[PDB]
Amino acid sequence: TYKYVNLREPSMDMKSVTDRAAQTLLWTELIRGLGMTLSYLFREPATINYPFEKGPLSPRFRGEHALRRYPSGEERCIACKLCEAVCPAQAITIEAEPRADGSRRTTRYDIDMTKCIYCGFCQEACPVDAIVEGPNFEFSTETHEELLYNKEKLLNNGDKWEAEIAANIQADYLYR
Amino acid sequence: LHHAVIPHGKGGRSSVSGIVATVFGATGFLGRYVVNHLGRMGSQVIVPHRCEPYDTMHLRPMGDLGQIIFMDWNGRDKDSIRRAVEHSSVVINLVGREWETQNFDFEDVFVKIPQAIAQVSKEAGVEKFIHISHLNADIKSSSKYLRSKAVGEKEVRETFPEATIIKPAEIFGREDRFLNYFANIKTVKQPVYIVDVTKGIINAIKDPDARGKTFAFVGPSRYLLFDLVQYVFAVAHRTTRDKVERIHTTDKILPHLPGLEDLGVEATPLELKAIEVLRRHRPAKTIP
Amino acid sequence: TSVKPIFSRDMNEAKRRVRELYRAWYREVPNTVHLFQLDISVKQGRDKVREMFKKNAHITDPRVVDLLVIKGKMELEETIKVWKQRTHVMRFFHETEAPRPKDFLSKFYVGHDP
Amino acid sequence: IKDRVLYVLKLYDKIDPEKLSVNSHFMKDLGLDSLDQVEIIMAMEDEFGFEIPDIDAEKLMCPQEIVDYIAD
Amino acid sequence: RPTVRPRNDVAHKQLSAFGEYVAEILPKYVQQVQVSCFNELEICIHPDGVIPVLTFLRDHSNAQFKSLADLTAVDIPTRQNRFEIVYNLLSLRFNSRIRVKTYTDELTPIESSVPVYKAANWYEREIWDMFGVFFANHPDLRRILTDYGFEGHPFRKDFPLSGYVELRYDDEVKRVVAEPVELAQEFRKFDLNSPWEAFPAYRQPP
Amino acid sequence: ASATRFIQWLRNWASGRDLQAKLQLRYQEISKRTQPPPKLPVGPSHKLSNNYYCTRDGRREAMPPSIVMSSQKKAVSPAPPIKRWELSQDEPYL
Amino acid sequence: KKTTGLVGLAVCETPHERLKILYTKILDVLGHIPKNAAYRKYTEQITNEKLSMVKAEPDVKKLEERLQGGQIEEVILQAENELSLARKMIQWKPWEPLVEEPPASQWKWPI
Amino acid sequence: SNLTLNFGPQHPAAHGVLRLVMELSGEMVRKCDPHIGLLHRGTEKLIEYKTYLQALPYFDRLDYVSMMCNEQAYSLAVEKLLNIRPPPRAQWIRVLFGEITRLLNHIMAVTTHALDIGAMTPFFWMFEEREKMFEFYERVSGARMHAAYVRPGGVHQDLPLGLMDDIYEFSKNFSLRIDELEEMLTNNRIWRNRTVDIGIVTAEDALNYGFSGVMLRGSGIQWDLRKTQPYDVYDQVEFDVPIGSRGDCYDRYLCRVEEMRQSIRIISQCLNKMPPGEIKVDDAKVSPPKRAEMKTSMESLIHHFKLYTEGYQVPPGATYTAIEAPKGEFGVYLVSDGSSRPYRCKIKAPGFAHLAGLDKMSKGHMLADVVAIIGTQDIVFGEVDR
Amino acid sequence: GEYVVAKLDDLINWARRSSLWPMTFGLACCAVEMMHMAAPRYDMDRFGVVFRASPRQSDVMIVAGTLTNKMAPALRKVYDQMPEPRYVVSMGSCANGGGYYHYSYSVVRGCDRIVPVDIYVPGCPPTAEALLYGILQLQKKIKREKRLRIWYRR
Numbered sequence A: 001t002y003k004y005v006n007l008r009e010p011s012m013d014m015k016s017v018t019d020r021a022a023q024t025l026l027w028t029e030l031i032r033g034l035g036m037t038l039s040y041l042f043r044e045p046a047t048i049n050y051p052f053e054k055g056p057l058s059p060r061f062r063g064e065h066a067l068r069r070y071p072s073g074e075e076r077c078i079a080c081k082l083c084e085a086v087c088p089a090q091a092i093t094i095e096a097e098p099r100a101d102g103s104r105r106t107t108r109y110d111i112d113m114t115k116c117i118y119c120g121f122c123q124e125a126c127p128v129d130a131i132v133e134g135p136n137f138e139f140s141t142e143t144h145e146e147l148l149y150n151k152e153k154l155l156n157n158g159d160k161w162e163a164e165i166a167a168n169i170q171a172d173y174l175y176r
Numbered sequence B: 001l002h003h004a005v006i007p008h009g010k011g012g013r014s015s016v017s018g019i020v021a022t023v024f025g026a027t028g029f030l031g032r033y034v035v036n037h038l039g040r041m042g043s044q045v046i047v048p049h050r051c052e053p054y055d056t057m058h059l060r061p062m063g064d065l066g067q068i069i070f071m072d073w074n075g076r077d078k079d080s081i082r083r084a085v086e087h088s089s090v091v092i093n094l095v096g097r098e099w100e101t102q103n104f105d106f107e108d109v110f111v112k113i114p115q116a117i118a119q120v121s122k123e124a125g126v127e128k129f130i131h132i133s134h135l136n137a138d139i140k141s142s143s144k145y146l147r148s149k150a151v152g153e154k155e156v157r158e159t160f161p162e163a164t165i166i167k168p169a170e171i172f173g174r175e176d177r178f179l180n181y182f183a184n185i186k187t188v189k190q191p192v193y194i195v196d197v198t199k200g201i202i203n204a205i206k207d208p209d210a211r212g213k214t215f216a217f218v219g220p221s222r223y224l225l226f227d228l229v230q231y232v233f234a235v236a237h238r239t240t241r242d243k244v245e246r247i248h249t250t251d252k253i254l255p256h257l258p259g260l261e262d263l264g265v266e267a268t269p270l271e272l273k274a275i276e277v278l279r280r281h282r283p284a285k286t287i288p
Numbered sequence C: 001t002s003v004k005p006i007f008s009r010d011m012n013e014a015k016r017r018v019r020e021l022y023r024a025w026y027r028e029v030p031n032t033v034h035l036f037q038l039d040i041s042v043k044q045g046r047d048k049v050r051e052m053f054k055k056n057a058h059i060t061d062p063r064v065v066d067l068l069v070i071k072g073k074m075e076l077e078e079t080i081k082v083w084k085q086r087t088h089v090m091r092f093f094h095e096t097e098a099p100r101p102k103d104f105l106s107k108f109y110v111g112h113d114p
Numbered sequence D: 001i002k003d004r005v006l007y008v009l010k011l012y013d014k015i016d017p018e019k020l021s022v023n024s025h026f027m028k029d030l031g032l033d034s035l036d037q038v039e040i041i042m043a044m045e046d047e048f049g050f051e052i053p054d055i056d057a058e059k060l061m062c063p064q065e066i067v068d069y070i071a072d
Numbered sequence E: 001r002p003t004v005r006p007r008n009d010v011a012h013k014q015l016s017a018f019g020e021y022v023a024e025i026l027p028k029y030v031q032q033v034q035v036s037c038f039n040e041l042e043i044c045i046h047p048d049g050v051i052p053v054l055t056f057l058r059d060h061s062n063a064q065f066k067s068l069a070d071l072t073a074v075d076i077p078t079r080q081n082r083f084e085i086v087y088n089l090l091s092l093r094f095n096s097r098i099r100v101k102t103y104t105d106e107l108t109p110i111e112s113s114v115p116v117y118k119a120a121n122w123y124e125r126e127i128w129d130m131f132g133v134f135f136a137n138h139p140d141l142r143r144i145l146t147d148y149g150f151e152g153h154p155f156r157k158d159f160p161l162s163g164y165v166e167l168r169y170d171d172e173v174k175r176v177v178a179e180p181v182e183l184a185q186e187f188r189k190f191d192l193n194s195p196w197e198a199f200p201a202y203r204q205p206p
Numbered sequence F: 001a002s003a004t005r006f007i008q009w010l011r012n013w014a015s016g017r018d019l020q021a022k023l024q025l026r027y028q029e030i031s032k033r034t035q036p037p038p039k040l041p042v043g044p045s046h047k048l049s050n051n052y053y054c055t056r057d058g059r060r061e062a063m064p065p066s067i068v069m070s071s072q073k074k075a076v077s078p079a080p081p082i083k084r085w086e087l088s089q090d091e092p093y094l
Numbered sequence G: 001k002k003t004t005g006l007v008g009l010a011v012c013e014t015p016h017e018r019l020k021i022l023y024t025k026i027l028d029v030l031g032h033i034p035k036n037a038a039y040r041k042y043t044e045q046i047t048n049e050k051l052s053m054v055k056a057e058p059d060v061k062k063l064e065e066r067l068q069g070g071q072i073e074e075v076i077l078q079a080e081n082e083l084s085l086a087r088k089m090i091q092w093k094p095w096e097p098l099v100e101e102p103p104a105s106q107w108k109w110p111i
Numbered sequence H: 001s002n003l004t005l006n007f008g009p010q011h012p013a014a015h016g017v018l019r020l021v022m023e024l025s026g027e028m029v030r031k032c033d034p035h036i037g038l039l040h041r042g043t044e045k046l047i048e049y050k051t052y053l054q055a056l057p058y059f060d061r062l063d064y065v066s067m068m069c070n071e072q073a074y075s076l077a078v079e080k081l082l083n084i085r086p087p088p089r090a091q092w093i094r095v096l097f098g099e100i101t102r103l104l105n106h107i108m109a110v111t112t113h114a115l116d117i118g119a120m121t122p123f124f125w126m127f128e129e130r131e132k133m134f135e136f137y138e139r140v141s142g143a144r145m146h147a148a149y150v151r152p153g154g155v156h157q158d159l160p161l162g163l164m165d166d167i168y169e170f171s172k173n174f175s176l177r178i179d180e181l182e183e184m185l186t187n188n189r190i191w192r193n194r195t196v197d198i199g200i201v202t203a204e205d206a207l208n209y210g211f212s213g214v215m216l217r218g219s220g221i222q223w224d225l226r227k228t229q230p231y232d233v234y235d236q237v238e239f240d241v242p243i244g245s246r247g248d249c250y251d252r253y254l255c256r257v258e259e260m261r262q263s264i265r266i267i268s269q270c271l272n273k274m275p276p277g278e279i280k281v282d283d284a285k286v287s288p289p290k291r292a293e294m295k296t297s298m299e300s301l302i303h304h305f306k307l308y309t310e311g312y313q314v315p316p317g318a319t320y321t322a323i324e325a326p327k328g329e330f331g332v333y334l335v336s337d338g339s340s341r342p343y344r345c346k347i348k349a350p351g352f353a354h355l356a357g358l359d360k361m362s363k364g365h366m367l368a369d370v371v372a373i374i375g376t377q378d379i380v381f382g383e384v385d386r
Numbered sequence I: 001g002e003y004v005v006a007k008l009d010d011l012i013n014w015a016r017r018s019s020l021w022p023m024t025f026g027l028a029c030c031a032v033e034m035m036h037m038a039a040p041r042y043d044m045d046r047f048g049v050v051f052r053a054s055p056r057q058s059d060v061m062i063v064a065g066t067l068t069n070k071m072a073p074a075l076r077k078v079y080d081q082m083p084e085p086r087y088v089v090s091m092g093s094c095a096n097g098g099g100y101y102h103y104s105y106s107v108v109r110g111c112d113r114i115v116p117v118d119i120y121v122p123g124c125p126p127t128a129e130a131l132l133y134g135i136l137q138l139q140k141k142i143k144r145e146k147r148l149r150i151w152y153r154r
């Protein structure tokens, strides 16, 4: 099924011809356009007062990465490298060895935040909710080097944001 | 060699040259070429600067991520000097000024500051020290600049006996105060190209023979000053009392000192690079 | 050993195109130095043209020669029409590349590469 | 002609006046290469202000042959 | 069956019949005709047949493939003719798609199909740029995607992913320069293939 | 929402519409930002019997292409001619 | 008809006459092709089928429905295309045997 | 005289950068030679080093105004090679967000076309609507643009509770926003002077030059892949295909505005016909299992482990799959060699053939018209250069 | 003396961070989020960041998208023609360091190989709000400048 967007015959009766001459000489359709912009002048603007007001986001939002812990304080990550395998940008670098207590834990966990595409595949792949993308999006820096996160930075991000991260996961985990 | 400073790679931006250099005076004419050459081969460069960080931005792209480190420093604060050189294997002093100021005179920049850098570098265990003096340094010069260059040249050798002192003639290049100086306005000059001076400095770092030596970096040809100024005006298609005195000092001939040739550098003729410098402002017979 | 030709049916026909392309490049160099305000001389530019031609002097396949001329003409068109910029022209000279060691001892000192 | 031709050929850097004979072969005697020959002919097209097609230029292997060609 | 893609035997039969039709009319050029299990018809032809076959498919009243959807190449280094040229055509009259494939190597040119489809102009420039296949009688053949002066043909299987050179700005020469590529982090090659066969239906004879 | 009645009339007259009925700014008609938890359904393969994977294995039902002709009567078209489209009855002409 | 609806495709005043001439020319051109060539057998069959409809139906709307090739001016355009192809086929001679076999593994996928 | 157009306008513009080398005689344009590749990023080569899942985000970044539509095209191609079928609810979600994406694209196409011609104000009004649609993207995927939401097998997650109500509230008011846009442009004599009889292309030429989408329908060709070669559940929704009569910029503008109205009409049916059920194919050798299953069942954990490391293997074969993307026919020629990584992935960008026709369409026009013709083609150089 | 230089620095710093005219290099998808920062919800004009700015009238360059090798010389040229003071904001992973295309043969691995960068805005793309946070961060960087303080002590 189709329709014509511009297949109309203008009437050639005198009344219709004089309607078009009036539009040509008196700029009626231009005046109409001025009416529309005038009405907007008197509308409330859509602008918000950033940084005092913020754009709305959802629990699923993919922001700055963080490494999480169990309630006891033990790290969740057990160096399985599923996140490193799936990462589409090869942004993750991991090394691991047996910890002094025998645990399977990483000795390196780097995310090059300038390689990362913020896709969230790592947190999908993680089997123990260890690597997540947090809600923070205001972490721009003055140097490139500050965006090459190592494990200490990511663990500090986890300890910094866990209060929000845990609530957001509580809100969305039944959709996963 | 500490394992972290063993050279690796192919000599490129991401390579490791094994050089950890603190470059005082890096934000100037000579410093931007020295830092660039160090960064080209993956050296760690410490850049202590007195100026606003905005004025150091041209140095940022010269090294791979993390290879250029900036620090604040004060000429008269030795603790700031120590922090900058503490981890370096070579210290390069390019500090200088072609005029005097209310806060810093020629004795400050060419004697007190170089001596302080050399002393703290020795106390910090720095292995190599590169100091830029001047070909026409002399304690009998009509120029206070060249007088101070001589006194500071002596104090650096006393403080850091293994220092490599380099004595260039007036340097010409895109950002010089030589060819640009003439294009903006008896004596014999032997000007030397900026890239040749830079290459010689880089080679003095890699060359164990250069330790304890004094070099004289001069161009290939000697020009009567009048012929040089006429040549500049032709190519261009066209100050202080001290600066005039320096410009009219004839370039000393010191055949006993080693030169660029001893460091493997081929002096660039002025005629080859004159257009490069002076193109934005739009052949002199030599003295055999 | 029966193949579809590109342009030239034998080496003699192919060498005619090579000489015609060399003529065009040879005459273009002075204009290129002026248009791009290059710091190199015309002799340096013409020496570069000769070096690039010489490196392929050992070819004996007329089809390979045709492709080399096809590519050489494309490169010339980029230069004449000023689709290239100054950086593209100067990429033939590798000015910022430090000379790489040639003899066995020099290579041995600097790394493991042959 | 002949004076003009030799003037260019003497002015050619790779050629020395000593071995430059009017009958010398650009290849065997003067040691030039095929691209040197093309360079020489381009100088002739400049001295006399006319074009020499590659089919003609590929036989002018001595200065005298150039003299003869220019005359025709 | 909810998870399995349903078959369409009617279209498989129609495309098979039209495949024989084309083979009967162009025996000089057609080497193979196949219909995939998801109902796509491919005509494999000798490279000499590009213009006759494409012209026939465009202009024949039972074909009318007036629209060239896509023209691309595939590099298979193990083949004597490593390059496979693929034409994806569309017929609005018969609401159908056909695929025409031929082959070439590094030194053998292919006839330009610009006379049949004006759409082919840039597609062939891209194939020349990315694979180095030369198209004879092309009005304006030159690179289209790569940088000026770029050497090599990046979509060839033997061209490295990161190339051979990389750019940066150099203050000394005051311009962007090109230098041999060095990576702070080498791309990490992964061996993913399971050592166990997945699809018996495609097993090749020993 | 908080425009004075006079301003509402002015911008309604100037635009020629009843803007107040379709404001571009969202107020309380939108969904709450805290929702009750979901309870999502499971697919048709969630069964305890009569669910052998070999009966629902789409990947293994794919076959190599049928070879119609290899170099190893009525004419036909690739499909029946497409049927002429019908004019919209919802609104044929804009 | 005021317009065909397709930009650049002019209306034809005499479509029945135009098609009769074009289909007759196509049959004439096909006569120079070998009798056994599949192109001639098939093209003649469909051309004769359409030529008969043109003769049977004097109503353009009812003829358009019978042919199923869009507007009548689209049928005329397609007839001109077929005639152009028929002339080219005579020089290509695609009814000849396969020019050359591909290398042994040319069309083998996967490798 | 020879002239080069600037890379981009002096206000924010998101189409990419173009080097247009033109030959002029007086006011008239005699030759147009677009020089592209300024956003060539070797996407097609990079995909060969990725698993099928890892390559999916690359399609968000092709026509990066039509993200989920590009995802749909790639997903359909892999589903065809896999011989599997996404569940009905996922198909409805894909059509729903496909049409929301069409609205996103047509706002950008129409309003930046106007903005470059000098009509700045509509861009601001309609980008507030785009901002609200970005919120729908973010609520289903967590990203405003590059959602990576539509995947082979279905979609990544089910709609959150309350989302469909919000999509209804948005859709309820959108036609009024279109009307305000038409008030500014449709009857404006300056707008008509800039677009009417500009860049005319005949139906015959449009086909031979490889055009698609509105570039065909503006010339009267009755073609739309959603109608003729339907995919997902497009055969289950009612809508009209707008058709032009003059084949010029003005008719193509009218076609895009009317397509936005039809997209609202389709969205309305999607909101009412959304079925229940799972949102990705219930085959754990293709689609990963639910997280609760992965943490409880041995089989689920293995399949989760393997799908996120090796990825699923795709049977060997080649497909050309195309959709009616907002900019035209968007297709992928995808070659599988039997492994978990594609052997070759050629991307057919509708803007590639459209831009190749710029020289043809600009003949006999003035310099200022070249801007209008580029706008009417709706060119994004992510898909042109790839 | 020091008091007068301190306040003059405050005045000129205030003027410059209050009148930031950006040149946007809309290279790829990041430019779309840049347009949304100009759109009504965020209205960067309300901070004094004008919508339309000519490269020769610009104070900040925003690199919004992937930088290819083919494009790198042209970007450097525009930067070189910018009158000072000039700042560069790198927006998004591609501009920051190559991003998804880091290992491509045709892509510059970060625009900071071509120009000095003042602010790096992370994300793929960064949200319009994240970009606005970066611009506000550049403003506070300008606020900390002490140009006259340094000059006085020379």
Ligand SMILES: NC(=O)C1=CN([C@@H]2O[C@H](COP(=O)(O)OP(=O)(O)OC[C@H]3O[C@@H](n4cnc5c(N)ncnc54)[C@H](OP(=O)(O)O)[C@@H]3O)[C@@H](O)[C@H]2O)C=CC1
Residues within 6 Å of the ligand: B024, B025, B026, B027, B028, B029, B030, B031, B049, B050, B051, B075, B093, B094, B095, B096, B097, B098, B104, B109, B132, B133, B134, B135, B167, B168, B169, B170, B171, B172, B177, B178
């Ligand atoms: N250029 C020539 O022709 C010759 C130069 N030389 C020597 O080379 C060296 C550098 O040459 P050039 O680079 O041209 O000199 P510049 O003036 O170009 O650079 C001077 C450097 O010294 C720093 N500096 C100056 N005064 C002070 C100070 N009081 N406290 C701290 N740092 C200071 C400057 O930092 P800021 O930017 O903060 O001022 C700048 O980095 C000097 O020692 C000079 O004497 C020798 C012979 C010839």
Ligand code: SF4
Residues within 6 Å of the ligand: A083, A086, A087, A088, A089, A090, A091, A092, A111, A115, A116, A117, A118, A119, A120, A121, A122, A123, A133
């Ligand atoms: S968000 Fe995506 S690109 Fe970034 S680290 Fe995780 S998997 Fe890699």
Ligand code: SF4
Residues within 6 Å of the ligand: A076, A077, A078, A079, A080, A081, A082, A083, A084, A094, A122, A125, A126, A127, A128, A129, A130, A131
């Ligand atoms: S973060 Fe998760 S997926 Fe990555 S290595 Fe640790 S446990 Fe494995």
Ligand code: SF4
Residues within 6 Å of the ligand: H061, H064, I028, I029, I030, I031, I064, I065, I066, I091, I092, I093, I094, I095, I099, I100, I123, I124, I125, I126
């Ligand atoms: S960083 Fe992401 S959004 Fe920005 S240009 Fe690159 S791929 Fe596009």
